[PDB]
DNA sequence: TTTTTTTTTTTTTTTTTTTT
DNA sequence: TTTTTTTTTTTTTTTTTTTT
């Protein structure tokens, strides 16, 4: 265990280096409660950053981190603040996931796999019912 | 066995000199029971001075020292001081170590590896337990 | 060797693959005589297209090719069309190199390295004589 | 000879990777003859970019570069500007050192070594002279 | 063996010379029992000179002092006194360093070695037992 | 010669390491045109920066220096800016010396001798001549 | 023939790159 | 006596058809 200011894909060494990635790889396993979240600014835009309990996990070394801030990519930022407003204490677990990416300066680009069921409607339900009827 | 009046990274011998950090690496052990604590201000802010038993260990040397005052670094000094308040008294052990550090002063930044399992809250439990049931 | 009607790195085959130079690579080696040159346009902007007699090289495969039509990427391209203007016919030779690049959308540069010693005021060649006196 | 866009520390690998100078070293050799500057904005401040004959010689490797455009750190850029003003062409010649440097967010300071003699008014050397003198 | 006054690192030939330490470096050896302390003043602050046997050795000389008076620096001192109280008598043995100190007016400071081994809490020899138990 | 952006013991290589003067000893010869002053401040006090020409070299390497900014210790400093105010342009030439210094925090004091004869008035001289005639 | 000299809190960190 | 800062970047490449 190794306690960290901020938890992110660089601290938990799981930020690919650049031109690196030939094939899908996972990357971490981030697990933790959000009470609320804070807006920041840097030279490549406004960003997020969490506060609670997170642990964080890499997969290439078994090192497992813990913190009480959390900074996360753009994409992974959107869905997890839609997903906290308020005094509500959040609970979320996901899978980061590299993928490459040819016209990318880096080479690859983030994946998110969930690792708790999210919430579907129950259309939707409906929708995958009737799919699965014909064949 | 080195008595010291204060116990520090430099009264140890484990503050690396700059510019000389190419690995990660552990530099000292401490380890002991706090009493009460103090705020005093330098140059570069305001820090925290603790009472009570300390005993640190070198790794590049081996040597053992001991003392009743520790003053530590900012994110350790966070750490403890949230978990000390008032009359109780705390144990505590904790590994330091060093990392590199591009765009640093010093070149380096540091770690901190608990030995004693902190608390973690039924919660996150619960959530590392979700994580280890699908894979 | 291969007739090509017009000799492009992706003709020759020397074109890396994007996310592909972990180590400067030379690809190609290519020499000729240009007659004339003609501008075209394209989606990412204009283009110069020289007319002559060239052959090329692959050092990967040492395939050897030949056309009379050379597109050339835009450092090499504006270094020729500022060495040809007119009626005069106009010999080069030149080896293509290929670089990493960090916040490329390919991972890699192109780099030029002329196999005929270029021109030289005899200014800079005085220049060079002092350089080589003191040490 | 390498044919590059713009001449600098990091286009002839001169460039000093951060926490890696532990002593005095000489990197580069640059000479040429200027014609014109402009200025440019970056998101670290202003610079200046130079215009004429340059070539470059990295001493680790000994390669050779040439280029039409330089851009120098801020103390040699100082100094050639103040060298250079309108129409005139102005004959530059200097060895690029790095030292170490504490409290540096790279580690290394870099240093300016002239290798044509630069002017010094009489009165100075009258100094001199009377120096020589007595001892 | 030499009878001695008052027992202190310059009777025994101890005391480094100013700007003198290049490395640590052990100066004397000091043992006895303590009957009582008695606290004096002089021009840089209070002292505290204890009673009792005192047997003191240098390490450059071999040369053996003994005494019934003793003056020690300020921590020794500290320690000593902390460790005496009432009609108590007190048993002590300790080697004395001198470590160099940059921003020192001598340029030494010195360092505190005992012999015999002091007593440690039960709570900080279980907290050794935990850390000794991991790796 | 070395370029410098200011010129001080410091960059010139001739600040001593501090407890290692054992004898008086030589360290730079500093001399050159001042034409202003600016005051400036910083922890440990108040300072004095010149503008001019300014050269300087080390003893114990003979390494030569070129400057426009000079600072110097307050005592060189204080000397100097007694001898310039206004608009007119002062010569000036010293050697720097270093002489032990206990009860110092750097073992060492800076000494002055300069290199051209200082003005005395014609009252001192007729003392001069007095203790020159009986003896 | 004497009490004399020794010590100081220092440094260490910063959001960055990923997508189109 | 000590300090009295210094450096980082300052972009790249992609295509530019071909056959029936």
Redo the contacts between chains.
């Keep these: ?3 960290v ?1 901020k938890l992110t894909l660089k601290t938990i060494g799981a930020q690919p280096k ?4 030939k094939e899908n790889t996972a990357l971490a ?1 981030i ?3 959000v009470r609320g979240k804070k807006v920041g600014q840097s ?1 490549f835009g406004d960003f997020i950053k969490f506060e609670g ?1 997170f ?1 964080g996990v890499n997969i290439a070394t078994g090192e497992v981190f ?1 913190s009480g801030a959390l900074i996360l990519p753009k994409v992974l930022e959107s869905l997890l603040a839609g997903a906290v407003d308020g005094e509500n204490t959040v ?1 979320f ?1 996901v899978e980061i996931w590299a993928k ?1 990416s ?4 880096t ?1 690859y680009e983030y994946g998110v796999k969930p ?2 069921e999210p919430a579907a409607s129950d259309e939707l339900a409906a929708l995958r019912n009737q799919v699965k009827a014909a064949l």
Tied chains: 1, 2, 3, 4, 5, 6.
């Design positions: 265990m190794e306690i200011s650049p031109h690196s990635v396993s697990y933790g409660r030279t309990e642990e813990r609970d677990a490459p040819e016209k990318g300066n080479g690792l708790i």
